[PDB]
Write a protein that binds this ligand. Structure first.
Ligand SMILES: [Ca+2]
Ligand SMILES: [Ca+2]
Ligand SMILES: [Ca+2]
Ligand SMILES: [Zn+2]
Ligand SMILES: [Zn+2]
Length: 156
């Protein structure tokens, strides 16, 4: 279980799904980092060039890490645990239809989870928690107490 050693983190969106207008991608990701920074001392700065701590991208099938994606459904996205290089990165399967409504799959809602991982969280057994292994969604995204407790046990 690795932690980031600095509380000020960098992220960059390498590319944009065409499923959603650009501005909506930006706001889904932004608001998702916000869920995590609101309840910890972490801060996040977006950059448009060069390497960031958390590199975010949309990819399909084999994309040169060791977890190829699988077409629509199944695995939706994955993220790496804190650390250098791919450490921290999050990848979204472009074979999904990404949304900004209650319809599958809500980008902001998946991002909230993947970034949990990007910051060092593993899965929760609580079905109401953003970190539950499995996608759940009814149209609102909030950390559950379980999420707050786990991110605070890491960052204070
Ligand atoms: Ca990284
Ligand atoms: Ca998939
Ligand atoms: Ca798509
Ligand atoms: Zn990947
Ligand atoms: Zn997960």
């Amino acid at each position: 279980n690795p932690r980031w050693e600095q509380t000020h983190l960098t992220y960059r969106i390498e590319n944009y799904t065409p499923d959603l207008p650009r501005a909506d991608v930006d706001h889904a990701i932004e608001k998702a980092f916000q869920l995590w920074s609101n309840v910890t001392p972490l801060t996040f700065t977006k950059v448009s060039e060069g390497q960031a701590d958390i590199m975010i991208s949309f990819v399909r099938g084999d994309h040169r890490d060791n977890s190829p994606f699988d077409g629509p459904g199944g695995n939706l996205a994955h993220a790496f645990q804190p650390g250098p290089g791919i450490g921290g990165d999050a990848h979204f399967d472009e074979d999904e239809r990404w949304t900004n409504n209650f319809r599958e799959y809500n980008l902001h809602r998946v991002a909230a989870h993947e970034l949990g991982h990007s910051l060092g969280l593993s899965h929760s057994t609580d079905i109401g928690a953003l970190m539950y292994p499995s996608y759940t969604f009814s149209g609102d995204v909030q950390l559950a107490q379980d999420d707050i407790d786990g991110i605070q046990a890491i960052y204070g």
